[PDB]
Amino acid sequence: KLRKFLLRYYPPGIILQYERVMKQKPIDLLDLTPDVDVEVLLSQIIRQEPLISENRRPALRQLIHRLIDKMLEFTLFKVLRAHILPLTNCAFNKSGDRFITGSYDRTCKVWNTFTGEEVFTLEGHKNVVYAIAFNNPYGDKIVTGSFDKTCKLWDAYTGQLYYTLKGHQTEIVCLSFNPQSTIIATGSMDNTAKLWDVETGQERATLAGHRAEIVSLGFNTGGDLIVTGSFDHDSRLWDVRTGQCVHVLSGHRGEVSSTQFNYAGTLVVSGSIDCTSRLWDVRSGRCLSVKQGHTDEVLDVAFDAAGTKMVSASADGSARLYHTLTGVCQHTLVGHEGEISKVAFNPQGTRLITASSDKTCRLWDCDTGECLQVLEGHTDEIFSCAFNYEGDFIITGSKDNTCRIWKALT
């Protein structure tokens, strides 16, 4: 029995709240353009969904109009010295009103991005805290992965330590909660990933098979599958419930640097030190596309929120921006004097930011490829840049051990 409709803007969608206890069932409108014929779309929504009856069509119509009206619509907010010893990572929560930092001082700090207050100092690790993450629709739990082979689970509101996850034989170098925040994944330099249960802390599975370090992780939107990128030149698709590898995605002639699912969960993009990015079919595990044109290592790959466009960042100082379905290269973004470590789309998929070793983060227009803004102020390389969920705030992390928060015009 349907109880509520909720609008999702990034990527477009409509969430179905029911009574049966509350799950939410999503209507994903990934290919929504402003010129959509609304009645055909409304008709197939009511047809596809047995919980949506004909009488809800007027409500459905106004929701879709708000989504269309939303497609028809940066200054320094704060500088914060996070640590004295090397800053390794930084990450927003969903809203952006909190961010976490990890360091060579074996801590993860929780920061109030409005006030600059260091809310908590998470201590107990005995080596570099290298990877950190929020359970980031919710933001109430924090996972820290360290070179002391261990991963810690914390409460973001009390600072309290829930669990210490032991089992890896070597440094932990990447991690992620799943979307439902029920399972933690840690990838290590012992060539394995491990899945852990958040409520019990007990290890749930070990994902073995890679022949070298796991540099990259990622769950799909449904928490159904997980991809791992590895120095053995492969990425692997794993089923989170069985614990088994479903596909080995080979084609990279060099170690994988980055991996990511599209929102639909039907594609993976990997970038690699062999100067290429690759597009894979999840269903069959085959390579749909090899994307060259970069002259130096590809360091980061991203889809936009909907997955209609994809971008690759390289050591050649450029970002190449493609259209996912056709594969056409729309723009090559030149301008950075250094290598490009990180790239992100805004939630609306209309602009793009890049973090570079030239101590600069640039804002680009996806339609024209013009550099809209050059974000300056860091005194060393920028290793990171990310938007909050709405795109009004950006966080850059640098090797100057400083975080800079940027805010969009009001």
Amino acid at 405: I
Contacts by 10-13 with C-beta closer than 8 Å and gap 24+?
A: 10/305, 10/347, 10/348, 10/389, 10/390, 10/391, 11/263, 11/304, 11/305, 11/306, 11/307, 11/349, 12/67, 12/306
**Which of 340, 333, 344 lies closest to 386, judged by CA?**
344
The single-letter code of the amino acid at 318 is S
Dig out the tokens for 286 from the structure: 């085959």
The residues with which 81 forms a beta bridge, in sequence order, are 402
* 3-class state of residue 60 by DSSP: helix
- DSSP category for residue 103: E
Please tell me whether residue 144 adopts helix, strand or coil conformation: strand
Structural contact between residues 393 and 406, judged by C-beta atoms closer than 8 angstroms: yes
Contact 245, 237 (CB under 8 A): yes
Tokens 């840049």 — which residue? Answer: 385
Q: End-to-end CA distance of the chain, in Å?
A: 40
Contacts of 178 (CB under 8 A, 6+ apart): 184, 185, 219, 223, 226, 240
Cβ(271)–Cβ(240) under 8 Å?
Answer: no
Give Cβ neighbours of residue 185 (< 8 Å, ≥ 6 apart).
175, 176, 177, 178, 193, 194, 195, 196, 217, 219, 226
Query: What are the φ/ψ torsions at residue 265 (nearest 5 degrees)?
Result: 80, 15
DSSP 8-state symbol, 219? B
d(CA 92, CA 391): 12
DSSP character at residue 69: H
99/387 Cα distance (integer angstroms): 12
16: β partners: 5, 25
Cβ-count burial 89-127 (b if 16+ within 10 Å, e if not):
bbbbbeebebbbbbbbbbbbbbbebeeeeeebebebbee
**How far is residue 320 from each of residues 316, 357, 365, measured CA to CA in Å?**
11, 17, 12
Burial of residue 295 (number of CB atoms within 10 Å: 0-12, 13-18, 19+)? exposed
Q: Could you tell me if 300 and 291 are in contact, meaning their C-beta atoms sit under 8 angstroms apart?
A: no
Contact of 80 with 98, CB cutoff 8 Å: no
Closest-CA residue to 371 (of 398, 335, 319): 335
Q: How far is CA 402 from the centre of its chain?
A: 21
Q: How many CB atoms lie within 10 A of CB 150?
A: 20
DSSP SS3 for 44: helix
Element containing residue 27 per DSSP (H, E): strand 24-28
CA distance 29 to 48: 13
Kindly list the distances between the CA atom of residue 381 and the CA atoms of 8, 91, 129, in Å, as whole numbers in the listed order: 35, 17, 19
- Integer Cα distance of 356 and 359 in angstroms: 6
Breaks (C-N over 2.5 A) in the chain follow: 20, 73
Looking up tokens 């047809």 gives 47
Render 224-279 in DSSP notation, one character per residue.
SEEEEEETTS-EEEEETTT--EEEEE---SS-EEEEEE-TTSSEEEEEETTS-EEE
Return d(Cα 226, Cα 249) in angstroms, integer: 13
Residue 78 to residue 114: CA distance in whole angstroms? 8
**25 closest CA partner among 47, 44, 46, 51:** 51
Q: 85 near 95, Cβ under 8 Å?
A: no
Q: Report how far apart, in Å, the C-alpha atoms of 20 and of each of 1, 25, 317, 393 are.
A: 7, 12, 53, 38
Angle between helices 38-48 and 57-71 (to 10 degrees): 130
Cβ-proximal residues to 62 (8 Å cutoff; 6+ apart), any chain: none
Q: Of all helices (H) and strands (E), which one includes residue 61? A: helix 57-71
324: tokens are 């996912």
Sign of CA dihedral 337, 339, 406, 404: negative
The C-alpha angle 141, 395, 105, rounded to 5 degrees, equals: 60
- Tokens representing 244 are 């088994």
The number of helices, as runs of H, and strands, as runs of E, in the chain is 2, 35
Contact between 235 and 229 under an 8 Å Cβ cutoff? The reply is: yes
Give yes or no for a contact between 143 and 177, defined as CB atoms under 8 angstroms apart. Answer: yes
Evaluate whether 106 touches 127 at the Cβ level (below 8 Å).
yes
Burial of 192 (0-12, 13-18, 19+ CB in 10 A): buried
Cα–chain center distance at 307: 12
Q: Give the E-state strand segments of 148-212 in sequence order.
A: 151-155, 161-165, 172-177, 183-188, 193-197, 203-207
> Alpha-carbon distance 196 to 170, whole Å?
17
